[PDB]
RNA sequence: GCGAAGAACCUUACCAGGUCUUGACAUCCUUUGACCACUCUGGAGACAGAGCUUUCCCGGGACAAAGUGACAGGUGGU
RNA sequence: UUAGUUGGGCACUCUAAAGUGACUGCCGGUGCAAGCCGGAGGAAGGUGGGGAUGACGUCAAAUCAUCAUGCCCCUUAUGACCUGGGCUACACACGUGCUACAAUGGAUGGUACAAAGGGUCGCGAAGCCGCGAGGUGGAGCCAAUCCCAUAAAACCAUUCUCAGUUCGGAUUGUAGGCUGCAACUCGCCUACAUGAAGCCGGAAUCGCUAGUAAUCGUGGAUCAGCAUGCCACGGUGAAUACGU
């Protein structure tokens, strides 16, 4: 019942070396307990594997990896009288990027290899090739949302 | 059983380890500050009265 | 070649009493440096507010002490007597 | 005394058994000091140690040297639930 | 000359600026060592990149206090205040990025009945 | 499976009293077909003018059951404290089911 | 091999600690008096190296002899009547720690 | 992780054993005015028996020696 | 000068007294007015951030045990002294915390960066000894001067290679240190060895909106000794808020 609605949003600083916004927002996503050095370093070294394994562009390939896992639709369930109906709805521009990084890192921890260094770098390779767990979940979101297209606006 | 207890604490004990501190006004054993030799209750009730120099309520 | 240490709970007495020394000292011992405001030392005492229960409700008290410093370079025969004569009130402690 | 300055032995307990060597386990010793380490001189003697409400007799062996008197006089009375 | 003493958190950084090549001196120690992170290194040059003077002046820094990031923030404010003294014509440029402002964020105080600044002990219904 | 805890003050918690409290509050199981195991807080106190008090708290997950009563003797209060508790279970359960069925 | 089978893929500093009565720190001296480097695989030491270690480890106590000594000490306390005997004989915590809660590592499940 | 901002003896308010009855703590009684402390013995200690000393200061005094009363003392209940 | 050291100077920080500064002050739009939206100046803009401050009253809420006190009760004891024991028990149930279940990690070596406090029957350095907890020693300090007091995470190199293990440390045997007249019931710490449950936790449930949560160290009260509790200090430092 309370609350005034819209609120301000945090800023992002342009990181050196790989000047980008997604990179800076990715560093803070996989950081734990405020250790910037640990989280930042594994990302910078991970881009080396991106160059050595399949060298196209460290700035690129990461790009379309994001634009291949960011969802287009979304489900925001609501409870109606008698039964709860999963209502499909669009995804805003800001949450478009947020749901990408979170899905990237949740399944980068579950990859199952020796180091987080390899695991994160390999995962974006699979996404850049329309494969992997991160790509898989977005299809689940789309399949479920498009299955309930009936009461989309109604 | 307190008048006996206060008198007991005044006189010197068998060894230096038996000795301890007691509140001067009331005489409770727990929570005594040896800067003032008052317990936490007598300290509050008498600091409000403006009789402890320097002591004032702390906002920050 | 004489230093003066002043401490007080209330600076209003301290600053006023400190000024009295400065005027009197320069009468004979003109070589007097200005008072130096040495850092104040503070202590807190958090106390349970209630009597029996309620450890979550407490109360905090403080004790701030202010200090000053007076330095004299070239003394005079009456400067010590002048310092001796000037007796500051209570609430301030002097120390030559 | 758990240090180099030890060991600690109670005076009135130590002196009583010292003059009881002529008895040679002929008299029970009734003492309260539980904080005395058992000496070699105590071996073979029987001492009654206060357990908080009464005196319990213990016969000193050679294996008991270096321990305290109270170790062989249990205080809390536990019998299960 | 060009004193631009700036602060951040618990850090105070007194910076004297002189024309030169671009060498940075911190407590008589090379600045490659004192600031290890290259990410922390770019922010030092923000007042020197809005105005094209990066390869023209030498900074002599005598910082004291605060954590390693704390001196990095306080030295950014240090040069900007000193650089603004060099020429007032840079004020609109630096103000746009918000570099003259001294950040007001400080660590809070602990409160009684709480396990920190705002952390509350676990509540049990029954 | 309910676990009890009686805080007897100014009174002795005799075994017959313990059995009486346990068996009377045990019939609430019929209503709430899955009562997750929870702790019951029961308080008893008697005044100088022969008045008895009972307080019951049964923190079910979404159901905070309470009732407090004052009567003549101890047994009347316990028998009269079921009515206040049974009302709340019937109030809370039938509120959820019928409203979501418009 | 050295009293009992030790791991092969492991390292001599780590493999030795697989016998009762030896530990990480003590493995530093037995690898020092043997004059052999710490970073050596177990399936690399020669007979001359392995011979010195067995000679060095002979002086220190090992399994069996140490296993029986500690049990003998435990037995000595059971019938002497010492307080620790009833703790050992009943399985309750022996040293000075409480029993109202948190004594499961010795009492069991 | 509440009174308890610190339970090995003390704290301690509980229990066992060993002890005292104007009393451990204040007022008014009366004789001396310092009163003790210490060493030895029995001592678990409290306490029982002996010796050295108790020097008050200025008719005043506070304490202490000695027995009596008025009296004291209760962390006993609401 | 080995070192801000010494000589020298308050230039800068710094400490603390007195002042300025933020008041919808100004501008534009909107409104009739309160006001609302945006913008400039500024370090700070809309009660800037945080504290102290808790109206009439409700719960016969808690405290006769901090203190006081009506009435009732005891008084060769329900008052007074001493030693020993207990408040530390244990088939079990619940609440609040600490440590983990490892590779963003363990181990080894090098090194940088704080704030806030305490110290006279007190803090206790250098030096020497011991693997260690610690011992001798006595400098300086009634302290912006000396001590407590080397901050830790972080950074840089090597190694371990996904296992109940070089993870985890409970538990236990032996040998020690320190306080105290005294460490068995019943203290803390050190050395060697033993090596348990535990590989992310069911139903359910808790905290938090920015220097916050999260994480890492530091100090103080009580204190001869003893805190994973309490009260304060700083280092690094997020994600999200469509909306009712
Ligand atoms: Mg003590
Ligand atoms: Mg509560
Ligand atoms: Mg009925
Ligand atoms: Mg303990
Ligand atoms: Mg709490
Ligand atoms: Mg006692
Ligand atoms: Mg005599
Ligand atoms: Mg005598
Ligand atoms: Mg206007
Ligand atoms: Mg504005
Ligand atoms: Mg107000
Ligand atoms: Mg009531
Ligand atoms: Mg009550
Ligand atoms: Mg009373
Ligand atoms: Mg307790
Ligand atoms: Mg380990
Ligand atoms: Mg012990
Ligand atoms: Mg070990
Ligand atoms: Mg298992
Ligand atoms: Mg595993
Ligand atoms: Mg301590
Ligand atoms: Zn008091």
Half-sphere CA count of G53, side-chain side, radius 13 A: 22
Structure determined by: cryo-EM
Q: Which of A109-137 are b and which e, b meaning 16 or more Cβ less than 10 Å from the residue's Cβ?
A: eeeeeeebbebbbbbbbbbbeeebbbbeb
CA angle B37/B39/B43 to nearest 5° reads 85
Work out whether strand C2-8 and strand C58-72 pair parallel, antiparallel, or are unpaired: antiparallel
Using omega within 30 degrees of 0 as the cis cutoff, is the peptide bond preceding D7 cis? yes
CA distance F23 to F21: 6
Q: How many CA atoms lie within 13 A of G39 on its CB side?
A: 0
Residue of E nearest to C54 (CA): E113
What are the start-end ranges of the H helices in B1-57?
3-10, 40-47
Flag whether D touches E (3+ CB pairs, 8 A cutoff). no
Q: At what angle do helices A133-147 and A116-128 cross, to 10 degrees?
A: 50
User: For A14, which DSSP code?
Assistant: -
DSSP state for residue F28 in the 8-state scheme: G
Asked whether E4 and E11 are in contact (CB, 8 A), the reply is: no
Tokens of B20: 């301890």
Q: Return the DSSP state at B33.
A: E
Which is it for the CA torsion E25, E29, E30, E32, positive or negative?
negative
Q: What is the C-alpha to C-alpha distance for residues F10 and F86, in angstroms, rounded to an integer?
A: 28
Cα E52 from Cα E90, distance rounded (Å) = 10
Degrees to nearest 5, angle at CA B34 with B28 and B36: 90
Contacts 24+ apart (CB under 8 A), C22-25: C22/C70, C24/C82, C24/C83, C24/C85, C24/C86, C25/C70, C25/C72, C25/C79, C25/C82, C25/C83
DSSP per-residue letters across A43-86: HHHHHHHHHHHS-S-SSTTHHHHHHHHS-SEEE--EE-SSSEE-
User: What are the DSSP E strand ranges found in chain B?
Assistant: 32-33, 38-39, 56-57
Q: Resolution for this model in angstroms, one decimal place?
A: 3.0
Chain I bases under 7 Å from protein CB? 12-17, 41-44, 48, 50-53, 62-63, 65-67, 79-86, 88-97, 103-105, 112-118, 143-144, 151-156, 159-162, 166, 170-174, 176-188, 191-196, 203-215, 221-224, 230-244
Contact E102, E77 (CB under 8 A): yes
Query: Which subunits count as partners of chain F given 3+ CB pairs below 8 Å?
Result: A, E
CB D37 within 8 A of CB D59: no
Distance, in Å, from the CA atom of D49 to the CA atom of D28, rounded to the nearest integer, reads 10
Strands in D46-50's sheet, in edge-to-edge order, are: D29-31, D46-50, D55-59
* H, E, C per residue of E12-35: EECEEEEECCCCEEECCEEHHHHC
Measure in Å the smallest separation between the Cα of G83 and chain D Cα atoms: 5
Sign of torsion, CA E66 E68 E72 E73? negative
Angle at CA of residue A11, ends A9 and A12, nearest 5°: 140
Exposure class string for C16-27: b at 16+ Cβ within 10 A, else e: ebbeebeebbee
Please count the other Cβ atoms lying within 10 Å of the Cβ belonging to residue D33.
17
- Give the CA dihedral F93, F95, F96, F97, nearest 10 degrees: 80
* β-bridge mates for residue F5, sequence order: F41
Residues 6+ apart with CB under 8 A from E44: E24, E31, E35, E72, E75, E76, E79
CA distance C9 to C64: 6
Distances in Å between the Cα of A66 and the Cα atoms of A19, A41, A56, E56, E105 are: 16, 21, 16, 41, 34
Q: Count other Cβ atoms within 10 Å, centred on residue C44.
A: 10
Q: Find the helix packing angle between A36-53 and A22-29, rounded to 10°.
A: 120
- Hey, CA dihedral for F27, F33, F39, F44, is it positive or negative? negative
> Any bridge partners for residue E26, and if so which?
E29, E61
Chain C contact for E123 (CB, 8 A cutoff): no
Q: Does D58 touch chain G (CB under 8 A)?
A: yes
Q: Name the nearest CA neighbour of D51 among D71, D73, D68.
A: D73
Q: At what angle do helices A93-109 and A133-147 cross, to 10 degrees?
A: 130
Tokens standing for residue G5: 């089978």
Nearest to D28 by CA among D52, D2, D58: D58
Among B45, A9, E52, F32, smallest CA distance to C50 is for B45
Please name which of E68, E82, E74 lies closest in space to residue E13, comparing C-alpha atoms: E74
b/e map D43-77, b = 16+ CB within 10 Å:
eebebbbbbeeeeeebebeeebeebbbbbbbeeee
Contact B55 C61 (CB under 8 A): yes
- How many angstroms separate the CA atoms of E31 and E27, rounded? 9
Distance CA A129, CA A127 (A): 5
Alpha carbon G79 to its chain centroid, in Å, reads: 26
Inter-residue contact D67 to D37 (CB < 8 Å): yes
As a whole number of angstroms, the distance between CA D27 and CA D21 comes to 10
| DSSP string of A75-116, one letter each residue | E--EE-SSSEE--EEE--HHHHHHHHHHHHHHHHHTS-SS-H
CB atoms within 10 A of CB E61: 22
Question: Which position has the token pair 């000037």?
Answer: C86
Sequence-distant (≥ 6) Cβ neighbours of residue C4 within 8 angstroms: C21, C68, C69, C70, C71, C72, C83, C94, C95, C96
Which residues in chain E have Cβ-Cβ distances shorter than 8 Å to C57? 113
Measuring from the CA of residue C14 to each C1', which nucleotide is nearest? I17
Cβ neighbours for E107, distance < 8 A, ≥ 6 positions apart: E9, E117
Contact predicate G34/G49, CB 8 Å: yes
Q: Hey, how many other C-beta atoms are within 10 angstroms of the C-beta on F68?
A: 13
Q: Quickly count: other Cβ atoms within 10 Å of residue G18's Cβ.
A: 14
Whole-angstrom Cα distance, residue F45 to residue F56? 13
Question: Which candidate, A93, A88, A85, A53, places its Cα nearest to that of A74?
Answer: A88
- Break chain D down into helix, strand, coil percent, rounded to 5: 20, 20, 65
Q: Is residue G42 a contact partner of residue G7, using CB atoms and an 8 Å limit?
A: yes
CA gap C54, E18 in Å, rounded: 62
Cα-based distances in Å from F74 to C78, D65, F18, F53, F65: 91, 62, 12, 7, 20
Measured between its terminal Cα atoms, the distance across chain G in Å is 38
**Cα angle: D9, vertex D12, D16; to 5 degrees:** 105
Nearest to A65 by CA among A54, A73, A74: A54
CA distances from G35 to A77, G16, G56, G58 (A): 71, 15, 11, 16
Q: Are A9 and A93 in contact (CB under 8 A)?
A: no
- Of E108, E80, E78, residue with least CA distance to E94: E80
List all chains that touch chain E, counting a touch as 3 or more CB pairs closer than 8 Å: A, C, F
């Amino acid at each position: 019942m309370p609350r005034k609605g819209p609120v301000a949003k945090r800023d992002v600083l342009p990181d050196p070396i790989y000047n980008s916004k997604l990179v800076t927002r990715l560093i803070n996503k996989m950081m734990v307990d405020g250790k910037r050095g640990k989280s930042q370093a594994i990302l910078y070294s991970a881009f080396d594997i991106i160059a050595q394994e399949t060298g196209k562009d460290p700035m690129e390939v990461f790009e379309q990896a994001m634009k291949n896992i960011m969802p287009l639709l979304e489900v925001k369930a609501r409870r109606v009288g008698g039964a709860n109906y999963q209502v499909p709805i669009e995804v805003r521009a800001d949450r478009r990027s947020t749901l990408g990084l979170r899905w990237l890192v949740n399944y980068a921890r579950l990859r199952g290899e020796k180091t987080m260094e390899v695991r994160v770098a390999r995962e974006i390779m699979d996404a850049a090739n329309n494969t992997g767990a991160s790509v898989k979940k977005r299809e689940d979101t789309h399949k479920m949302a498009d299955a309930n297209r009936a009461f989309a606006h109604y | 059983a307190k008048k006996s207890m206060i008198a007991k604490q005044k006189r010197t004990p068998k060894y230096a380890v038996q000795a301890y501190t007691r509140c001067e006004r009331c005489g409770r054993p727990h929570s005594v500050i040896r800067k003032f030799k008052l317990c936490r209750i007598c300290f509050r009730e008498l600091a409000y009265k403006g009789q402890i120099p320097g002591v004032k309520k702390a906002s920050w | 070649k004489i230093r003066i240490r002043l401490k007080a709970y209330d600076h209003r007495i301290l600053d006023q009493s400190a000024e009295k020394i400065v005027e009197t000292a320069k009468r004979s011992g003109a070589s007097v440096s200005g008072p130096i405001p040495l850092p104040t030392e503070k202590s807190i005492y958090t106390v349970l507010r209630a009597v029996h229960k309620y450890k979550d409700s407490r109360e905090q008290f403080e004790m701030r002490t202010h200090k000053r410093l007076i330095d004299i370079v070239n003394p005079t025969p009456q400067t010590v007597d002048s310092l001796m004569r000037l007796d500051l009130p209570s609430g301030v402690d002097i120390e030559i | 005394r758990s240090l180099k300055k030890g060991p600690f032995v109670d005076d009135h307990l130590m002196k009583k058994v010292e003059a009881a060597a002529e008895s040679e386990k002929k008299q029970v010793i009734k003492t309260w000091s539980r904080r005395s380490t058992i000496f070699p001189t105590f071996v073979g003697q029987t001492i009654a140690v206060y357990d908080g409400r009464k005196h319990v007799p213990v016969y000193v062996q050679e294996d008991m040297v270096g321990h305290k008197l109270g170790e062989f006089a249990p205080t809390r009375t536990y019998r299960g639930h | 000359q060009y004193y631009g003493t700036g602060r951040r958190k618990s850090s105070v950084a007194r910076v004297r600026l002189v024309p030169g090549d671009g060498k940075i001196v911190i407590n008589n120690r090379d600045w490659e060592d004192y600031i290890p992170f290259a990410a922390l290194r770019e922010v030092i040059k923000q007042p020197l990149v809005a105005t094209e003077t990066l390869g023209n002046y030498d900074v002599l820094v005598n910082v004291h206090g605060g954590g390693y990031t704390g001196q990095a923030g306080a030295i950014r404010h240090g040069v900007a205040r000193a650089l603004l003294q060099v020429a007032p014509e840079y004020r609109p440029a630096l103000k746009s990025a918000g570099l003259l402002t001294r950040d007001p964020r400080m660590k809070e105080r602990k409160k009684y009945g709480l396990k920190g600044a705002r952390r509350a002990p676990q509540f049990s219904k029954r | 499976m309910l676990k009890y805890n009686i805080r007897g003050e100014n009174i002795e918690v005799t075994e017959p009293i313990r059995d009486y409290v346990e068996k009377k509050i045990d019939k609430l199981e019929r209503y709430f077909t899955e009562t997750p195991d929870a702790n019951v807080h029961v308080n008893l106190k008697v005044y100088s003018d022969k008045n008895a008090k009972v307080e019951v708290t049964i923190p079910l997950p979404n159901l905070v059951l309470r009732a407090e009563e004052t009567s003549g003797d101890l047994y009347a209060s316990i028998d009269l404290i079921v009515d206040k508790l049974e009302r709340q279970i019937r109030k809370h359960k039938t509120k959820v089911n019928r409203k979501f069925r418009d | 091999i050295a009293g009992v089978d030790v791991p092969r893929e492991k390292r001599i500093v780590i493999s030795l600690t697989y016998i009762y009565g030896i530990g990480k720190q003590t493995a530093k001296e037995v690898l020092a008096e043997a004059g052999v480097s710490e970073d050596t695989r177990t399936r690399d030491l020669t007979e001359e190296e392995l011979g010195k270690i067995r000679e060095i480890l002979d002086r220190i106590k090992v399994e069996g002899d140490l296993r029986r000594e500690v049990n003998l000490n435990i037995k000595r306390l059971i019938e002497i009547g010492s307080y620790r005997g009833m703790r050992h004989r009943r399985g309750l915590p022996v040293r000075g720690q409480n029993t109202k809660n948190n004594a499961r590592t010795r009492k069991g499940p």
